[PDB]
Subunit: 115 residues, 2 copies
């Protein structure tokens, strides 16, 4: 690291990487609107909220948590115009209401931090 | 983890662990006040700013940076009543001005995120 990197850190703050607790709520917030997959969950976040990021590590730690708890289901889908199938996630019916509650936490979290 | 941990994250935000860039400025801020040592640098942060923490890993990543750049000097101090010596740090004489500039970054950083 260089001394200039210190100044840069304060001048141009790096993006905030979601921790697992927040990522879980963000993921459920998205899945409640419709099925999505890993790469899209990450891309959608940084495209709409440029000062935010979701790492592969946190993403799949969150997915593991959700699948271990039977909160979501996954299935492989062949997307149009793409050769590589993607594993689509959907909220399990049993978690619909609980998921809505967690999704609210993300909606409020991002709103308060950007307004 | 557990669902309750998710709710806890939002209801009772966990303290912020300093990243290297910020820790470097915080450490210089303290050293400008007088010589200090690792354990004190960590404890003093929590005491002065209860919503912040400094990990042992970031502390010594910061110390490495400072020593590599000759911004601080280290030496062994014998304490009365204790067998194990203590490793003390002091800002290097010629780094006075630069350390003060970096210290200001810390003060502003902590001011905006705490006041």
């Amino acid at each position: 690291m260089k001394i200039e990197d210190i100044y840069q850190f304060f001048e141009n703050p790096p993006p905030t990487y979601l921790c697992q607790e927040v990522a879980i709520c963000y993921i459920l917030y998205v899945l409640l609107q419709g099925e999505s997959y890993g790469t899209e969950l990450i891309q959608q976040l940084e495209t709409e909220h440029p000062t935010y990021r979701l790492s592969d590590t946190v993403l799949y730690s969150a997915i593991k948590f959700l699948e271990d708890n039977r909160a979501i289901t996954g299935y492989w889908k062949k997307l149009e115009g793409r050769g590589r199938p993607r594993r689509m996630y959907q909220v399990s019916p049993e978690w619909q209401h609980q998921a809505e509650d967690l999704a609210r936490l993300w909606q409020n979290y991002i709103y308060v931090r950007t307004n």
